[PDB]
């Protein structure tokens, strides 16, 4: 058997290059000022999930997520996150983002360090109600980042996937588009 050929990032995000503009802003702010992304691109309807594809020892994100889940049960015992397995809205997303480990992503300039595939797709709902449909933008990222382990105060290496669904924003939004869906998959974490 021969594994499928591997090609570089396939970026088909249309005329306005939103995938470039968004991702440039996102990973810059994710490292340095994470929570400011929320008012810029997220709203009351945005859905976020973190899932783990492996069981790395001393996984720092796993620890922080477990602490978050514990604290949520203490403060909001009948929150639907238990069975829904996702977090909805700027407010709750912000609380989780606060405890997820600090990170350092490579520059988007290092093309070989990133696998970014995106395309525009039809038949989202129009949040303005003016049209029957809206166009969406799917952006899937596979890459690596430095991810902090506070127990040692050292950065480890995290392999991750992150899938964004972007769509037109609600009226009065800071940008013409918003994040509808943000799915983060954390794979291997290795100490450096």
């Amino acid at each position: 058997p021969t594994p499928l050929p591997q090609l570089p990032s396939n970026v088909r995000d249309g005329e306005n290059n939103v995938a470039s503009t968004f991702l440039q802003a996102f990973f810059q702010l994710w490292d340095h000022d994470r929570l400011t992304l929320i008012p810029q691109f997220y709203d009351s309807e945005t859905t976020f999930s973190v899932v783990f594809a492996t069981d790395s020892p001393q996984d720092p994100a796993s620890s922080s997520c477990s602490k978050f889940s514990r604290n949520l049960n203490i403060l909001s015992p009948r929150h639907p996150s238990t069975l829904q397995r996702l977090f909805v809205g700027s407010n709750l997303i912000a609380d989780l983002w606060k405890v997820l480990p600090a990170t350092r992503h490579p520059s988007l300039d290092q093309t070989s360090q990133w696998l970014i595939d995106c395309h525009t797709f039809p038949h989202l709902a129009d949040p303005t109600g003016m049209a029957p449909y809206a166009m969406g933008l799917m952006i899937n990222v596979n890459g690596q980042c430095e991810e902090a382990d506070i127990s040692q105060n050292l950065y480890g290496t995290r392999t991750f996937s992150r899938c964004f669904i972007l769509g037109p924003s609600k009226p009065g939004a800071p940008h013409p588009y918003r994040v509808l869906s943000d799915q983060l998959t954390l794979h291997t974490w290795k100490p450096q």
């Binding site: 995000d13 249309g14 939103v18 166009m135 588009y177």
Partner: peptide
């Protein structure tokens, strides 16, 4: 007439 910001 799709709402397309992209």
């Amino acid at each position: 007439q799709v709402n397309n910001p992209f």
